[PDB]
Symmetry: C3
Subunit: 113 residues, 3 copies
Amino acid sequence: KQPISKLTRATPGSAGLDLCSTSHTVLTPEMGPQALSTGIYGPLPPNTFGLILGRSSITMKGLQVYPGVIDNDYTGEIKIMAKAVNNIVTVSQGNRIAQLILLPLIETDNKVQ
Amino acid sequence: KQPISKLTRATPGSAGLDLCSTSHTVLTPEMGPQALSTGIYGPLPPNTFGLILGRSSITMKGLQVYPGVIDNDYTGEIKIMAKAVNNIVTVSQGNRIAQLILLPLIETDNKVQ
Amino acid sequence: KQPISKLTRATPGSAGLDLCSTSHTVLTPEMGPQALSTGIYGPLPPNTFGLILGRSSITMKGLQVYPGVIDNDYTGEIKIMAKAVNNIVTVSQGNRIAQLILLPLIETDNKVQ
Ligand SMILES: O=c1ccn([C@H]2C[C@H](O)[C@@H](COP(=O)(O)NP(=O)(O)OP(=O)(O)O)O2)c(=O)[nH]1
Ligand SMILES: O=c1ccn([C@H]2C[C@H](O)[C@@H](COP(=O)(O)NP(=O)(O)OP(=O)(O)O)O2)c(=O)[nH]1
Ligand SMILES: O=c1ccn([C@H]2C[C@H](O)[C@@H](COP(=O)(O)NP(=O)(O)OP(=O)(O)O)O2)c(=O)[nH]1
Ligand SMILES: [Mg+2]
Ligand SMILES: [Mg+2]
Ligand SMILES: [Mg+2]
């Protein structure tokens, strides 16, 4: 397992930490949502949670990443939920296919139930 | 009407407050976006706004929630904008179908026009 | 080029800064993702990044905006990545078709590589 501290940012001012596919995968529109492996695991830094979002160059190529929430205390593998929009999409091993955004986790008194 | 203070978090470290459907609803891909009732209303805590996002177990089952912005001063009912991706999806009353994330509302000098 | 300081908020408590299409554009579902021009450019205020999200009245009319990340130091034109969901969608010049949300940019020690 690899922690999110192993992820890289494309540039200093990049909001997102890039997530790469660990598998070669072909996706077609009739397959609907697929969960792609990253080999990266939570959890996240204190007082933060994560959002997985598409990379724009990838979205424009017809692979939709559904926005996903990563909980602060998730310790499982971060997966990318993805769907081929219109056409056949081929993901290669190591391709940067999404990005992780870190956001402040606001405390509230909502019941934890 | 029920305020967002009535929502619950799945776990202490869960970023999202779960939103449940108040109706049994069937959705098909040809129907396109539908707005599901929650019986939960704004507004939000001071200096925050909301994002409605999908729950991953729900997205993976073929129901797409379109990300939606909840304004700090919205006092209407929070609705979930949803679409069946490929297949027929049946939502039952009380099913947790999305989640509300709270985020800091940044002040800017943009004209309010 | 116009900076994001030229954007307007619908109301004082609106989280989003509205983005308008500068072109008349027709979109069909078979066209897949299209990048709509706004004539608005980064960069963003210090310590912030942006998210482009749909407006709910627009999403409900069948035009999906794919959530997009605007980096703090992006100096290019902000484009809206959009797709007609089920039907033919006609965007007119000046129509508010998405919104820009500003969010705090969290610093981490991830390699910038
Ligand atoms: O894109 C995603 C979304 C979620 N996840 C993981 C991390 C997150 O903390 C965990 C739970 O996410 P959600 O709350 O969105 N899913 P759901 O509500 O279906 O499961 P749970 O009841 O555990 O909260 O799933 C991913 O790996 N990728
Ligand atoms: O998923 C959503 C998105 C928005 N909303 C409500 C809350 C939000 O404050 C209100 C307005 O949202 P948008 O600005 O996204 N919609 P639009 O720009 O079409 O309407 P307005 O001109 O009032 O801002 O709609 C929901 O209930 N669910
Ligand atoms: O909806 C969007 C998304 C991104 N963008 C622009 C701004 C953002 O800073 C820039 C890069 O975005 P991403 O990182 O999402 N794209 P990608 O990873 O494909 O390109 P790069 O390798 O440059 O980061 O693209 C838009 O104009 N609209
Ligand atoms: Mg990028
Ligand atoms: Mg959950
Ligand atoms: Mg609006």
